[PDB]
Amino acid sequence: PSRDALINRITHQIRQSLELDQILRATVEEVRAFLGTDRVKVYRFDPEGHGTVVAEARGGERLPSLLGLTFPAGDIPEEARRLFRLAQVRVIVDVEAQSRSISQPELQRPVDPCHVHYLKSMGVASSLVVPLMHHQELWGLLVSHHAEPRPYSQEELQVVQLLADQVSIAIAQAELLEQARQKAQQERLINQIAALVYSPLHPETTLTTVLEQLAAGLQGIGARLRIHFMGADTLCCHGVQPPASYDTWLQEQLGRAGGWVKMWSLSHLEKWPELQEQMKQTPIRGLLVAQLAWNDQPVGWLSVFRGAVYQETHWAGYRWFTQGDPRQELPLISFAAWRELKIDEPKAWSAAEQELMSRVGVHLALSITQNQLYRQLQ
Ligand SMILES: CCC1=C(C)/C(=C/C2=NC(=C\c3[nH]c(/C=C4\NC(=O)[C@H](C)[C@H]4CC)c(C)c3CCC(=O)O)/C(CCC(=O)O)=C2C)NC1=O
């Protein structure tokens, strides 16, 4: 009926863009408009299971904004994620009655008291959670909260489920486009670095920009390059730098020959407590290192540095972070917990980024070896 026309229009709106942010904003807005509820949100999960409120629509100021909030994976037990990975919608109509209805696509159960206390503390009277699948995994959740009690029609449930399936498809296609674009940008960065590597300009001028653009494309707070080959011993830096002893460290752990690419977090430097502490006194929390050695002989070292991942977000820009709404008590505690897990942990680099590091390192090693052999034959 008019239901199918509504689903058609909303699906057109969700699928209009291949940009993930536009997809999720259209999703939350359209679903909140359909349901008339106070707050509709999308929670996205990371590989470790931690959740981030990545999109949000509100009908007014009755419920506070949670956009940008992050919470530890443990806030949703694996027992709940099991049901969600088996495609399962969960509605709590009354928080005071503590009822929990569970429905499948295509009658009342109890609910854990801790989650009831959580929803009460946020001033949430009614909750509807629909899972968002990506291939076989649980990409995230579509969440509708309301400050007064309200039931949910079965046709409302099926409309939200069908919209969730369209959201899943849009997520997959946006991912296809994003992977293509990232592959393009990575190859472009490799070639742009090679453009400056063999350039006849002053090495200190070109290589500093090389390190700067390398740090840029790998979202690193800094970059460093130490060449120690034949008669050439040089050190170029950009951005945040480690203590100089780091260089000597890389020379004494060469057996961990040839060329390689390695990742390290601050935690991985537990063996060397003095270097670990010096590194701590630095914003550096992650290191991507490439031993420049295209030939069998070691040539140098190329490093990119990332900070702690928590610092990568302007948490003070959010309303929930600074303003003392009591309903933000338990969410903020959750955030605190998450902050305790990622206060010294960096964002890891992908396998594609490590391969990029390896390729840039091969270019660097070959270039330096060629130049030094040409200067030694003189
Ligand atoms: C963005 C702010 C926010 C957070 C963080 C949040 C947490 C949260 N707790 C959930 C469930 C759950 N959470 C818990 C347990 C707990 N959870 C805790 O934070 C405690 C540490 C612990 C109790 C001691 C349990 C047991 C469930 C499953 C409840 C059930 O369906 O029976 C779910 C899954 C949705 C659902 O099935 O209702 C979410 C999203 N909800 C929000 O809106």
Coordinates of N, CA and C in Angstrom, one line a residue, residues 70-200:
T70 N 31.9 7.4 22.3 CA 32.5 6.1 22.1 C 32.4 5.3 23.4
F71 N 32.2 4.0 23.3 CA 32.0 3.1 24.5 C 32.7 1.8 24.3
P72 N 33.2 1.2 25.4 CA 34.0 -0.1 25.3 C 33.1 -1.2 24.8
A73 N 33.8 -2.2 24.1 CA 33.1 -3.3 23.6 C 32.3 -4.1 24.7
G74 N 32.8 -4.1 25.9 CA 32.2 -4.8 27.0 C 30.8 -4.3 27.4
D75 N 30.5 -3.1 27.0 CA 29.1 -2.6 27.3 C 28.0 -3.3 26.7
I76 N 28.3 -4.0 25.6 CA 27.4 -5.0 25.0 C 28.0 -6.3 25.1
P77 N 27.5 -7.2 25.9 CA 28.1 -8.6 26.0 C 28.1 -9.3 24.7
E78 N 29.0 -10.3 24.6 CA 29.0 -11.2 23.5 C 27.7 -12.0 23.4
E79 N 27.0 -12.2 24.5 CA 25.7 -12.9 24.4 C 24.7 -12.1 23.6
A80 N 24.7 -10.7 23.7 CA 23.8 -9.9 22.9 C 24.3 -9.8 21.5
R81 N 25.6 -9.7 21.2 CA 26.1 -9.7 19.9 C 25.8 -11.0 19.1
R82 N 25.7 -12.1 19.9 CA 25.3 -13.3 19.2 C 24.0 -13.2 18.6
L83 N 23.0 -12.8 19.4 CA 21.6 -12.6 18.8 C 21.6 -11.6 17.7
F84 N 22.4 -10.5 17.8 CA 22.5 -9.5 16.7 C 23.1 -10.1 15.5
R85 N 24.2 -10.8 15.6 CA 24.7 -11.5 14.4 C 23.8 -12.5 13.8
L86 N 22.8 -13.0 14.6 CA 21.8 -13.8 14.0 C 20.5 -13.0 13.6
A87 N 20.7 -11.7 13.3 CA 19.7 -10.8 12.8 C 18.5 -10.7 13.7
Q88 N 18.5 -9.9 14.7 CA 17.5 -10.0 15.8 C 17.2 -8.6 16.3
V89 N 16.0 -8.1 16.2 CA 15.6 -6.8 16.7 C 15.1 -6.9 18.1
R90 N 15.5 -5.9 19.0 CA 15.2 -5.9 20.4 C 14.5 -4.6 20.8
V91 N 13.3 -4.8 21.3 CA 12.5 -3.6 21.7 C 12.2 -3.7 23.2
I92 N 12.5 -2.6 24.0 CA 12.0 -2.5 25.3 C 10.9 -1.4 25.3
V93 N 9.7 -1.7 25.5 CA 8.6 -0.8 25.4 C 8.5 0.0 26.7
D94 N 8.6 -0.6 27.8 CA 8.5 0.0 29.1 C 9.8 -0.3 29.9
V95 N 10.5 0.7 30.2 CA 11.7 0.5 31.1 C 11.3 0.2 32.5
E96 N 10.2 0.8 33.0 CA 9.7 0.5 34.3 C 9.1 -0.9 34.4
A97 N 8.4 -1.4 33.3 CA 8.0 -2.8 33.4 C 9.1 -3.8 33.1
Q98 N 10.2 -3.3 32.6 CA 11.4 -4.1 32.3 C 11.1 -5.3 31.4
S99 N 10.3 -5.0 30.4 CA 10.0 -6.0 29.4 C 11.0 -5.9 28.2
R100 N 11.1 -7.1 27.5 CA 12.1 -7.2 26.4 C 11.5 -8.1 25.3
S101 N 11.0 -7.5 24.2 CA 10.5 -8.2 23.1 C 11.6 -8.4 22.1
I102 N 11.6 -9.6 21.4 CA 12.6 -10.0 20.5 C 12.0 -10.5 19.2
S103 N 12.3 -9.9 18.1 CA 11.7 -10.2 16.8 C 12.7 -10.6 15.7
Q104 N 12.2 -11.4 14.8 CA 13.0 -11.8 13.6 C 12.4 -11.1 12.3
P105 N 13.2 -11.1 11.3 CA 12.7 -10.5 10.0 C 11.6 -11.4 9.4
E106 N 11.2 -11.1 8.2 CA 10.1 -11.8 7.4 C 8.8 -12.0 8.2
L107 N 5.9 -14.0 23.8 CA 6.1 -12.7 23.0 C 6.9 -11.7 23.8
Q108 N 7.1 -11.9 25.1 CA 7.8 -11.0 25.9 C 8.8 -11.7 26.8
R109 N 10.0 -11.2 27.0 CA 11.1 -11.8 27.7 C 11.7 -10.8 28.7
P110 N 12.3 -11.3 29.7 CA 13.0 -10.4 30.7 C 14.2 -9.7 30.1
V111 N 14.7 -8.6 30.7 CA 15.8 -7.9 30.3 C 16.8 -7.7 31.5
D112 N 18.1 -7.7 31.2 CA 19.1 -7.6 32.2 C 18.9 -6.3 33.0
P113 N 19.1 -6.4 34.3 CA 18.8 -5.2 35.1 C 19.9 -4.1 34.9
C114 N 21.1 -4.4 34.6 CA 22.1 -3.4 34.4 C 21.8 -2.5 33.2
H115 N 21.3 -3.1 32.1 CA 20.9 -2.4 30.9 C 19.6 -1.5 31.2
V116 N 18.7 -2.1 32.0 CA 17.6 -1.3 32.4 C 18.0 0.0 33.2
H117 N 18.9 -0.2 34.2 CA 19.4 0.9 34.9 C 20.1 1.9 34.0
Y118 N 20.8 1.4 33.0 CA 21.5 2.3 32.0 C 20.5 3.1 31.3
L119 N 19.5 2.5 30.7 CA 18.5 3.2 30.0 C 17.7 4.2 30.8
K120 N 17.4 3.8 32.1 CA 16.7 4.7 33.0 C 17.6 6.0 33.3
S121 N 18.9 5.7 33.5 CA 19.8 6.8 33.8 C 19.9 7.8 32.7
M122 N 19.7 7.4 31.5 CA 19.7 8.3 30.3 C 18.4 8.9 30.0
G123 N 17.4 8.6 30.9 CA 16.0 9.2 30.6 C 15.4 8.5 29.5
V124 N 15.7 7.3 29.1 CA 15.2 6.6 28.0 C 14.1 5.7 28.5
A125 N 12.8 5.9 28.0 CA 11.7 5.0 28.3 C 11.5 3.9 27.4
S126 N 11.8 4.0 26.1 CA 11.6 3.0 25.1 C 12.8 2.9 24.2
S127 N 13.1 1.7 23.8 CA 14.3 1.4 23.0 C 13.9 0.4 21.9
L128 N 14.4 0.7 20.7 CA 14.3 -0.3 19.6 C 15.7 -0.4 18.9
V129 N 16.2 -1.6 18.9 CA 17.6 -1.8 18.3 C 17.5 -2.8 17.2
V130 N 17.9 -2.4 16.0 CA 17.9 -3.3 14.8 C 19.4 -3.5 14.4
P131 N 19.8 -4.7 14.1 CA 21.3 -4.9 13.8 C 21.5 -4.4 12.3
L132 N 22.8 -4.0 12.1 CA 23.2 -3.6 10.8 C 24.3 -4.5 10.3
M133 N 24.1 -5.4 9.4 CA 25.0 -6.4 8.9 C 25.9 -6.0 7.8
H134 N 27.2 -6.4 7.8 CA 28.0 -6.2 6.6 C 28.6 -7.6 6.3
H135 N 28.2 -8.1 5.1 CA 28.5 -9.5 4.7 C 28.0 -10.4 5.9
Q136 N 28.9 -11.0 6.6 CA 28.5 -11.9 7.7 C 28.7 -11.3 9.1
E137 N 29.2 -10.1 9.2 CA 29.6 -9.5 10.5 C 28.6 -8.4 10.9
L138 N 28.7 -8.1 12.2 CA 27.8 -7.1 12.8 C 28.5 -5.7 12.7
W139 N 28.2 -5.0 11.6 CA 28.8 -3.7 11.4 C 28.4 -2.6 12.4
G140 N 27.2 -2.7 12.9 CA 26.7 -1.7 13.8 C 25.2 -2.0 14.1
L141 N 24.6 -0.9 14.8 CA 23.2 -1.0 15.2 C 22.5 0.3 14.9
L142 N 21.2 0.1 14.5 CA 20.3 1.2 14.4 C 19.5 1.3 15.7
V143 N 19.5 2.4 16.3 CA 19.0 2.5 17.7 C 18.0 3.7 17.7
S144 N 16.8 3.4 18.3 CA 15.7 4.4 18.5 C 15.4 4.5 20.0
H145 N 15.6 5.7 20.6 CA 15.3 5.9 22.0 C 14.2 7.0 22.0
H146 N 13.3 6.8 23.0 CA 12.2 7.7 23.3 C 12.0 7.9 24.8
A147 N 11.7 9.2 25.1 CA 11.7 9.6 26.5 C 10.4 9.2 27.2
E148 N 9.3 9.0 26.5 CA 8.1 8.5 27.1 C 7.9 7.0 26.5
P149 N 7.1 6.2 27.2 CA 6.8 4.9 26.7 C 6.1 4.9 25.4
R150 N 6.5 4.0 24.5 CA 5.6 3.8 23.3 C 5.8 2.4 22.7
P151 N 4.7 1.7 22.3 CA 4.9 0.4 21.7 C 5.4 0.6 20.3
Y152 N 5.5 -0.5 19.5 CA 5.9 -0.4 18.1 C 5.0 -1.4 17.3
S153 N 4.4 -0.8 16.3 CA 3.6 -1.7 15.4 C 4.5 -2.7 14.7
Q154 N 3.8 -3.8 14.3 CA 4.5 -4.8 13.5 C 4.9 -4.4 12.2
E155 N 4.1 -3.5 11.5 CA 4.4 -3.0 10.2 C 5.6 -2.0 10.4
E156 N 5.6 -1.2 11.5 CA 6.7 -0.4 11.8 C 8.0 -1.2 11.9
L157 N 8.0 -2.3 12.6 CA 9.1 -3.2 12.7 C 9.6 -3.7 11.3
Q158 N 8.6 -4.1 10.4 CA 9.1 -4.6 9.1 C 9.6 -3.5 8.2
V159 N 9.0 -2.2 8.3 CA 9.6 -1.1 7.6 C 11.0 -0.8 8.0
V160 N 11.2 -0.8 9.3 CA 12.6 -0.5 9.8 C 13.5 -1.6 9.4
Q161 N 13.1 -2.9 9.4 CA 13.9 -4.0 9.0 C 14.3 -3.9 7.5
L162 N 13.3 -3.6 6.6 CA 13.6 -3.4 5.2 C 14.6 -2.3 5.0
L163 N 14.3 -1.1 5.6 CA 15.2 0.0 5.5 C 16.6 -0.4 6.0
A164 N 16.7 -1.2 7.0 CA 18.0 -1.7 7.5 C 18.7 -2.5 6.5
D165 N 18.0 -3.4 5.8 CA 18.6 -4.1 4.7 C 19.1 -3.2 3.6
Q166 N 18.4 -2.2 3.2 CA 18.9 -1.2 2.2 C 20.1 -0.5 2.8
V167 N 20.1 -0.2 4.1 CA 21.3 0.5 4.7 C 22.5 -0.4 4.6
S168 N 22.3 -1.7 4.8 CA 23.4 -2.7 4.7 C 24.0 -2.7 3.3
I169 N 23.1 -2.7 2.3 CA 23.6 -2.7 0.9 C 24.3 -1.4 0.6
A170 N 23.8 -0.3 1.0 CA 24.4 1.0 0.8 C 25.8 1.0 1.5
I171 N 25.9 0.4 2.7 CA 27.2 0.4 3.3 C 28.2 -0.4 2.5
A172 N 27.8 -1.6 2.0 CA 28.7 -2.4 1.2 C 29.2 -1.6 -0.1
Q173 N 28.3 -0.9 -0.8 CA 28.6 -0.2 -2.0 C 29.5 1.0 -1.7
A174 N 29.2 1.7 -0.6 CA 30.1 2.8 -0.2 C 31.5 2.3 0.1
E175 N 31.5 1.1 0.7 CA 32.8 0.5 1.0 C 33.6 0.2 -0.3
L176 N 32.9 -0.4 -1.3 CA 33.6 -0.6 -2.6 C 34.2 0.7 -3.1
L177 N 33.4 1.7 -3.1 CA 33.9 3.0 -3.7 C 35.1 3.5 -2.8
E178 N 35.0 3.4 -1.5 CA 36.1 3.9 -0.6 C 37.3 3.1 -0.8
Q179 N 37.2 1.8 -1.0 CA 38.4 1.0 -1.2 C 39.1 1.4 -2.5
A180 N 38.3 1.5 -3.6 CA 38.9 2.0 -4.9 C 39.6 3.3 -4.6
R181 N 39.0 4.3 -4.0 CA 39.6 5.6 -3.8 C 40.9 5.6 -3.0
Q182 N 40.9 4.7 -2.0 CA 42.1 4.6 -1.1 C 43.2 3.9 -1.9
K183 N 42.9 2.9 -2.7 CA 43.9 2.3 -3.5 C 44.5 3.4 -4.4
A184 N 43.7 4.2 -5.0 CA 44.1 5.2 -5.9 C 45.0 6.2 -5.2
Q185 N 44.6 6.7 -4.0 CA 45.4 7.6 -3.3 C 46.7 7.1 -2.8
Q186 N 46.7 5.8 -2.5 CA 48.0 5.1 -2.0 C 49.0 5.0 -3.2
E187 N 48.5 4.5 -4.3 CA 49.4 4.5 -5.5 C 49.9 5.9 -5.9
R188 N 49.0 6.9 -5.8 CA 49.4 8.3 -6.1 C 50.4 8.8 -5.1
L189 N 50.3 8.5 -3.8 CA 51.3 8.9 -2.9 C 52.6 8.2 -3.2
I190 N 52.6 6.9 -3.5 CA 53.9 6.2 -3.8 C 54.6 6.9 -5.0
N191 N 53.8 7.2 -6.1 CA 54.4 7.8 -7.2 C 54.9 9.3 -7.0
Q192 N 54.1 10.0 -6.2 CA 54.5 11.4 -5.8 C 55.7 11.4 -5.0
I193 N 55.9 10.4 -4.1 CA 57.2 10.4 -3.4 C 58.3 10.0 -4.3
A194 N 58.1 9.1 -5.2 CA 59.2 8.7 -6.2 C 59.5 9.9 -7.1
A195 N 58.5 10.8 -7.3 CA 58.8 12.0 -8.1 C 59.8 12.9 -7.4
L196 N 59.8 13.0 -6.1 CA 60.7 13.8 -5.4 C 62.0 13.1 -5.0
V197 N 62.0 11.8 -5.0 CA 63.1 11.0 -4.5 C 64.3 11.2 -5.5
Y198 N 64.0 11.0 -6.8 CA 65.1 11.1 -7.8 C 65.3 12.6 -8.3
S199 N 64.6 13.6 -7.7 CA 64.7 14.9 -8.2 C 66.1 15.5 -7.9
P200 N 66.7 16.3 -8.8 CA 68.0 16.9 -8.7 C 68.1 18.0 -7.7

